[PDB]
Design a protein around this nucleic acid. Structure first.
Ligand code: MG
Ligand code: MG
Ligand code: MG
Ligand code: MG
Ligand code: MG
Ligand code: MG
Ligand code: MG
Ligand code: MG
Ligand code: MG
Ligand code: MG
Lengths: 50, 63, 50, 107, 31, 59
RNA sequence: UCUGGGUCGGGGUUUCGUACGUAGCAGAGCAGCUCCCUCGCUGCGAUCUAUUGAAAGUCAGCCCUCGACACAAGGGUUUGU
RNA sequence: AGAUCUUGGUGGUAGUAGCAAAUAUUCAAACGAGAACUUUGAAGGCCGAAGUGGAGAAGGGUUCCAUGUGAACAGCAGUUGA
């Protein structure tokens, strides 16, 4: 986690056109690799893996 | 084996406490053969039993 | 998402990068070195390595 | 060779962190004995009494942060034992632990 | 007479403790 | 990117850090952490603390 | 494995606050030494200053090492349409 | 078959509650089939002279002291022991 500073563009608010700080969470997201495909068929008992 | 008797006799002969009785850890068999105060005197003279000095309590700080 | 809180464009002005392993007070290594100047470890570093 | 001897430094502070006051020094010698079992593989580890004094030098809770020891793997050809080797760990007095590597030491 | 080897072992049999402890004065064997 | 403040220690205070003090006489101070704040609150002179900017410029 | 994970070491970060020793014509002063000196020198003396944002710790549940050292194709118990 | 029956024996509970008042142990060696507990040595600690020290009165009655044993006892163990 860390925090930022940003300009708010919310009209009618007190913090309009003002700087605020806000906690943020950094989530490292390296690219995913696709390795398969699953099909599903709708049945009167739910989805089942085709 | 067990030198409980010899430490007690050495304390009485040396006129000290068992705190101040030092029996040789290497000559355990020699000391174990001394079942009388006369042999304890011989071991003290030979140096197998030694009276340790009094723990230092200096008064240099107080002075 | 139809509310004004959503679909609101975010424009960051500053991202904090002080040390979170304590009360960090410098954003970058270069800013820390510029503020404090040379230290004893660097003074002997230039002495031993010329 | 299996009669090797090496000079290590052990971060006692690392291995004692979290132990209670009346158990820090006893745990330090359990961690030293467990340490020597790792780099030497011998379950028979003997700790020199001078090293025992060094650990207990500042009482039972203020154990030194670092200790410089010398592991000495020796032959157990003194009696019929399940272990053919034993490691005798000794004490090495040092003035500083800076830039102290694990060094092989001769006889 | 005292040589280097006898002096080396003498350091062992004269120290019966650590720092601040008394040095051993004698170890005589008689029968 | 806001106003950049300076502490009892004279260090730079970035937004979202420290606290601000508003005395009754109308003066406003700002501190970088509780170490710099509590030194100020104990009537301690910054020119006598070796890690303070005011000390380093005096010496 | 195009190695691995450890243990030390290093660097970073951070915590506290400027270490021991040495030096000073710094220092309330005091006690000695004056053919002496023409204003001097020898000790004791908290504290101060320079060395010195120094010293010390920092994963054990901090970050990066690819520096050094050793070790890692070993063990045991089971499992069949 | 009963009497909260008498005497004796045995279960479940249950390998459970528990073996938590008074700071604290550690290293090496010896003996020994066997050592966390015995002994010796080395450290680190406590009692801190209104003591966990040194001696008595009452009470106990051989617990005193040597040697040996390792059955039972010392609510773990013991090579130790009142
Ligand atoms: Mg934090
Ligand atoms: Mg490191
Ligand atoms: Mg009946
Ligand atoms: Mg009936
Ligand atoms: Mg239980
Ligand atoms: Mg219990
Ligand atoms: Mg006391
Ligand atoms: Mg009494
Ligand atoms: Mg008796
Ligand atoms: Mg029992």
């Amino acid at each position: 986690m860390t925090h930022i500073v940003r300009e708010v563009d919310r009209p009618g608010s007190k913090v309009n056109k003002k700087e605020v700080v806000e906690a943020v969470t950094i989530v490292e997201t390296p690219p995913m690799v696709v390795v398969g495909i699953v099909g599903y068929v709708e049945t009167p008992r739910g989805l089942r893996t085709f | 084996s067990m030198l409980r008797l010899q430490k007690r006799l050495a304390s009485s002969v040396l006129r000290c406490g068992k705190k101040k009785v030092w029996l040789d850890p290497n000559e355990t068999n020699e000391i174990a053969n001394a079942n009388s105060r006369q042999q304890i005197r011989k071991l003290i003279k030979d140096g197998l039993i030694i009276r340790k000095p009094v723990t230092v309590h200096s008064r240099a700080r107080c002075r | 998402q139809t509310k004004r809180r959503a679909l609101e464009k975010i424009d960051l002005k500053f991202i904090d990068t002080t040390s979170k392993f304590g009360h960090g007070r410098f954003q970058t290594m270069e800013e820390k070195k510029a503020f404090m100047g040379p230290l004893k470890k660097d003074r002997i570093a230039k002495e031993e390595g010329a | 060779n299996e009669v090797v001897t090496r000079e290590y430094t052990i971060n006692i502070h690392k291995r004692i962190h979290g132990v209670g006051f009346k158990k820090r020094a006893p745990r330090a010698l359990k961690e030293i004995r467990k340490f020597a079992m790792k780099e030497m593989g011998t379950p028979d580890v003997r700790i020199d009494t001078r090293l025992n004094k060094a650990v207990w030098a500042k009482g039972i809770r203020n154990v030194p942060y670092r200790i410089r020891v010398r592991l000495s793997r020796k032959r157990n050809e003194d009696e019929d034992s399940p272990n053919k080797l034993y490691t005798l760990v000794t004490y090495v007095p040092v003035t500083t632990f800076k830039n102290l590597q694990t060094v092989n030491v001769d006889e | 007479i005292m040589n280097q080897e006898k002096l080396a072992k003498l350091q062992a049999q004269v120290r019966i403790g650590g720092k601040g402890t008394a040095r051993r004065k004698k170890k005589v064997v008689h029968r | 990117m806001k106003v950049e403040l300076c502490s009892f220690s004279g260090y730079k205070i970035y937004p979202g850090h420290g606290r601000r003090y508003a005395r009754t006489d109308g003066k406003v101070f700002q501190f970088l952490n509780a170490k710099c704040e509590s030194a100020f609150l104990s009537k301690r002179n910054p020119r006598q603390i070796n890690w303070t900017v005011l000390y380093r410029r005096k010496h």
